[PDB]
Amino acid sequence: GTFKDYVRDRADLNKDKPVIPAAALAGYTGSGPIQLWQFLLELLTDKSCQSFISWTGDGWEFKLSDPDEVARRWGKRKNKPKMNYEKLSRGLRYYYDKNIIHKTAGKRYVYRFVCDLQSLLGYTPEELHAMLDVKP
Amino acid sequence: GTFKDYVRDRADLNKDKPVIPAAALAGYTGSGPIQLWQFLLELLTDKSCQSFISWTGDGWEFKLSDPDEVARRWGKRKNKPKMNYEKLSRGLRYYYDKNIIHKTAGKRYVYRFVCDLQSLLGYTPEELHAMLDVKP
DNA sequence: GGAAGCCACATCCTCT
DNA sequence: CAGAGGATGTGGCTTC
DNA sequence: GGAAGCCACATCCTCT
DNA sequence: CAGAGGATGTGGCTTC
């Protein structure tokens, strides 16, 4: 397998094509280092990540079906191997007061984007959900 | 402008489409952090970067038409704002002994990939030069 | 998890 | 500077 | 370039 | 744990 085949094979697994690349987003917003909410928003728009993180179908609500995986990847993106959902959730918890992301009380591993995503990605959650083939 | 527009606009400038993405290459080779030679290989395959870095038309030979720009970007990709051609060249000098890249004596800012790129990107420099519309 | 190494540079400097 | 390399130091990663 | 700040987490801990 | 937050500490970046 050459580089060509390595890229080709990942494409056939629907990887490397998130609609909202974190890196790009950070660039657009001028946030500098990639931020958590941004990273999640990248995953949530990359069809290949739908197995461990996805939109519930209700507005900007999403679920961390596989916390441990979401955590690993965020841990990798920030170069922090000890990263787990137990510290990552702390990150998200900070957002509550900064009204960026809120916790949906009662549902394990479910939060919701509360800020104005439509203006940032020019898409109503209904459209986005259709583009990713969001089930519910 | 929204993130959507920001993405399509850069797309119309032929950006964000390098044939040999550094990040991917690093993954394929399992090198871990992106390496200099790999970065340069990304730029050289991204049609939008042809103004400050490009193949001379002779095999794997290339030129840093705009050293200062090349240096800035590499400085950005590694998070090292003080990054210049004066230091970056050092990095390249280190490949001379590791037969990965050599200096073409006589031409200011011109070096040549000496390792086996054909096997890594399954392309003869002739083909690659055609895909980028390399002039000389 | 965890400490100990290994490697690519990032930095600085000296010559020519 | 541009272009060789030696002397250092450290961060991100592989390795016990 | 350069020193001083700011901000987003990464880490740890305590309850319920 | 999962999930709220307080108390800390530091790296990447913005700001004088």
Residue numbers in the entry:
A (entry chain D), B (entry chain A): 302 to 437
Text from the published report:
Ets1, a founding member of the Ets (E-twenty-six-specific) family of transcription factors, was initially identified as the protooncogene corresponding to v-ets of the E26 leukemia virus. Ets1 regulates expression of lymphocyte-specific genes, bone-specific genes, and genes involved in vascular development and angiogenesis. Ets family members contain a highly conserved DNA-binding Ets domain, an 85-amino acid winged helix-turn-helix DNA-binding domain which recognizes a core motif 5′-GGA(A/T)-3′ referred to as Ets-binding site (EBS). In the case of Ets1, autoinhibition is mediated by structural coupling of the regions flanking the DNA-binding domain.
To verify Ets1 dimer binding to two separate pieces of DNA we crystallized and solved the structure of the complex comprised of Ets1 dimer and two pieces of DNA [referred to as (Ets1)2•2DNA]. The asymmetric unit contains two Ets1 molecules (residues 280–441) forming a dimer. Each Ets1 is bound to a separate piece of dsDNA resulting in formation of (Ets1)2•2DNA quaternary complex. Briefly, at each position the interactions involve the N-terminal portion of HI1 helix from one subunit and H4 helix, a loop H4H5, HI2 helix and a loop HI1HI2 from another subunit. However, within (Ets1)2•2DNA complex additional hydrogen bonds are observed between each Ets1 subunit and the neighboring DNA duplex. Superimposition of Ets1 dimers with and without DNA shows that DNA binding introduces only minor local changes in Ets1 dimer structure with the root-mean-square deviations for the 271 matched α-carbon atoms at 0.86 Å. The only notable difference is the disorder of the seven N-terminal residues within (Ets1)2•2DNA complex.
